[PDB]
Amino acid sequence: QVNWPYVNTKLKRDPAVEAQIEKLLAKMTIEQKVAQMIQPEIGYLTVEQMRKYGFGSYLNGGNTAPYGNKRADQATWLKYADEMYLAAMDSTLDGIAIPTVWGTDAMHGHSNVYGATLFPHNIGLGAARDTDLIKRIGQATAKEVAATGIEWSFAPTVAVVRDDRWGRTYESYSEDPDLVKRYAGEMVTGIQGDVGADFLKGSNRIATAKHFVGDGGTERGVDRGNTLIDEKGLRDIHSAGYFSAINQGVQSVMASFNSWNGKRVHGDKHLLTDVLKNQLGFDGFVVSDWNAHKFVEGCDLEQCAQAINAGVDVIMVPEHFEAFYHNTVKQVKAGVIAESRINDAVRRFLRAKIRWGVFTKSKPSARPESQHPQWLGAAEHRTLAREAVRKSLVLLKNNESILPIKASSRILVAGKGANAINMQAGGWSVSWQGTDNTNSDFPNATSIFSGLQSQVTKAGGKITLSESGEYTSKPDVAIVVIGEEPYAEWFGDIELLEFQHETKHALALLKQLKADNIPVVTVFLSGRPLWVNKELNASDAFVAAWLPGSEGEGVADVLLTNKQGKTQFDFTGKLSFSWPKYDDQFTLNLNDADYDPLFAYGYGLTYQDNINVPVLSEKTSP
Numbered sequence: 001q002v003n004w005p006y007v008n009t010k011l012k013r014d015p016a017v018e019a020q021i022e023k024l025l026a027k028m029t030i031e032q033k034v035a036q037m038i039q040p041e042i043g044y045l046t047v048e049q050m051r052k053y054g055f056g057s058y059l060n061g062g063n064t065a066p067y068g069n070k071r072a073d074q075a076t077w078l079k080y081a082d083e084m085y086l087a088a089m090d091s092t093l094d095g096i097a098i099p100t101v102w103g104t105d106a107m108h109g110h111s112n113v114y115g116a117t118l119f120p121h122n123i124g125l126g127a128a129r130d131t132d133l134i135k136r137i138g139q140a141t142a143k144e145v146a147a148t149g150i151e152w153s154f155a156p157t158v159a160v161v162r163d164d165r166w167g168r169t170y171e172s173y174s175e176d177p178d179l180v181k182r183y184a185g186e187m188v189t190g191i192q193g194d195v196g197a198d199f200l201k202g203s204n205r206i207a208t209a210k211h212f213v214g215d216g217g218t219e220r221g222v223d224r225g226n227t228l229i230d231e232k233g234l235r236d237i238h239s240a241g242y243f244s245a246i247n248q249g250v251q252s253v254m255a256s257f258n259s260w261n262g263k264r265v266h267g268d269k270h271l272l273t274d275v276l277k278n279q280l281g282f283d284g285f286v287v288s289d290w291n292a293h294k295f296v297e298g299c300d301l302e303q304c305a306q307a308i309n310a311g312v313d314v315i316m317v318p319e320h321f322e323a324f325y326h327n328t329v330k331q332v333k334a335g336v337i338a339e340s341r342i343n344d345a346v347r348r349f350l351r352a353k354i355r356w357g358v359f360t361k362s363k364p365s366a367r368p369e370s371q372h373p374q375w376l377g378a379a380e381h382r383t384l385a386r387e388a389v390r391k392s393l394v395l396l397k398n399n400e401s402i403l404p405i406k407a408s409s410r411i412l413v414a415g416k417g418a419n420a421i422n423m424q425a426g427g428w429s430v431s432w433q434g435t436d437n438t439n440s441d442f443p444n445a446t447s448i449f450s451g452l453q454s455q456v457t458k459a460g461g462k463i464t465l466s467e468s469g470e471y472t473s474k475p476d477v478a479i480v481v482i483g484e485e486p487y488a489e490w491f492g493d494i495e496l497l498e499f500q501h502e503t504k505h506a507l508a509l510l511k512q513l514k515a516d517n518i519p520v521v522t523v524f525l526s527g528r529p530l531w532v533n534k535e536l537n538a539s540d541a542f543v544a545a546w547l548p549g550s551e552g553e554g555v556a557d558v559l560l561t562n563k564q565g566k567t568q569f570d571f572t573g574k575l576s577f578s579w580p581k582y583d584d585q586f587t588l589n590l591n592d593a594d595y596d597p598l599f600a601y602g603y604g605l606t607y608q609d610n611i612n613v614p615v616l617s618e619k620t621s622p
């Protein structure tokens with residue numbers, strides 16, 4: 001057998017909290033216990049249903065917003081939170097007064113909420129190599145979540161991605177488990193507070209580390225695919241983030257969509273109980289992913305004893321929660337789910353709600369952390385995100401030191417991504433895919449063109465925006481902003497590594513500018529390295545900017561001099577994913593036996609280098 005380390009070494013239980021739990025459990029019926037374990041979503045839940053059942057939690061799925069209103073005032077969010085809170089404190093119909101909690105996914109800030117600060121996606125945060133930065137982003141994120149009356153946020157994502165074909169590659173900090181391990185505990189403590197006197201106090205939120213486990217190791221990077229690896233590899237490559245997150249006392253863990261050697265993780269008792277709970281020693285609660293239970297053998301949308309028996313404590317059933325609730329009760333009464341199992345699930349979940357202060361705090365709109373609407377999209381947070389943007393950029397090529405550009409130059413800005421905030425933000429940004437977003441969906445955000453314009457104008461230079469690369473006066477330099485369209489999950493799964501393999505539209509723009517003898521600085525937006533030898537050859541400089549988020553001016557901060565013509569910020573980012581030399585290097589990872597990357601893990605030029613990148617082979621595999 002494979003031995004996993006015990007990693008819950010810091011958080012000690014609170015005896016007063018445990019006494020309350022035991023007292024509560026002793027008086028609860030089977031029905032009240034099961035209610036705590038079921039999680040409806042606001043697109044399908046009514047206040048009357050909450051009064052009737054007293055569900056343990058409910059989900060902000062991000063597709064609906066409170067009362068159906070696409071955008072909504074703080075008072076509207078807090079009114080909804082109060083209505084649900086009072087419905088659950090009403091023991092009239094279900095016979096008990098256990099306060100519910102609201103949960104939300106926080107992909108890069110409070111990212112499904114209109115007006116929220118959008119931080120760079122994880123891959124670029126990985127490039128930054130800055131653990132203190134990560135902790136501060138967690139702190140900012142807790143405040144923005146608190147400002148909407150939500151107690152529980154899903155973050156960090158600790159996937160370690162080994163095949164970049166996966167549509168969720170950008171949600172991972174690195175292909176390297178050591179980097180993810182360094183980061184995970186910082187995000188957990190940033191959100192929840194450090195283990196100690198401030199643990200879960202004030203604006204601190206309950207956190208969820210996702211996803212357990214191996215979703216970044218599926219064959220061919222298929223989303224929700226099959227992870228083929230022995231147990232030691234599962235432990236040493238894919239679980240490193242959980243070691244530090246559990247050690248820092250993360251309150252919740254979310255189970256994963258993928259399979260491990262042919263078995264769905266959500267139904268695997270060995271993973272979710274024996275490994276996660278018994279060996280690693282996780283003392284918090286396991287939450288399932290969105291209708292993930294339906295894919296477990298023998299389960300469906302309205303029933304899944306297997307997942308509950310495997311070690312899932314809270315079931316995310318956004319739509320079918322009512323039928324799922326009644327079915328689960330009948331299964332406990334039939335004896336096919338042990339009362340001891342239900343008791344343990346409720347213990348672990350109440351241990352989180354009670355210790356966070358659910359009985360001690362007032363109703364949502366009256367809590368101290370609800371009195372600060374400015375926290376949502378706060379200037380201080382946008383300043384933090386802008387710093388993250390600067391540190392996330394990786395300079396791949398800078399021939400003849402064309403960067404940094406004098407701010408007083410005449411600059412042309414071109415490419416589809418030049419003034420498109422939806423491209424710089426990527427998926428999980430107000431909407432799911434990000435495709436339908438326009439610039440007005442991001443108030444107070446700044447596009448890359450806008451950031452450049454601001455600084456060039458201040459320096460007395462001239463700037464022009466033209467996506468197609470048209471100009472009146474021939475510029476000194478063209479900054480071309482190009483990249484992937486936004487995507488989330490399986491919509492982003494690819495089979496070919498070549499950028500825009502079907503159209504090569506951006507390449508034609510680059511070549512057009514080169515043929516006119518205009519120097520070219522490419523700013524590449526993507527959720528992953530891609531095979532871009534051709535585009536690199538058509539560029540004098542080439543910057544991997546990943547998916548920088550709302551603060552586009554961080555790009556100008558690095559690429560441009562100040563008004564005096566001096567460097568203001570140098571590049572500091574280093575690759576956290578290996579960059580492919582050939583279009584078929586699908587699994588190119590640090591420490592591989594045959595490791596032949598174009599640019600290795602840890603690579604990143606700075607203005608102190610005087611290195612040229614020569615013309616590269618443009619041959620593609622058959």
Ligand SMILES: [Ca+2]
Binds near residue numbers: 162
């Ligand atoms: Ca890799």
Ligand SMILES: [K+]
Binds near residue numbers: 294296299300
């Ligand atoms: K099934």
Ligand code: NA
Binds near residue numbers: 094
């Ligand atoms: Na109740």
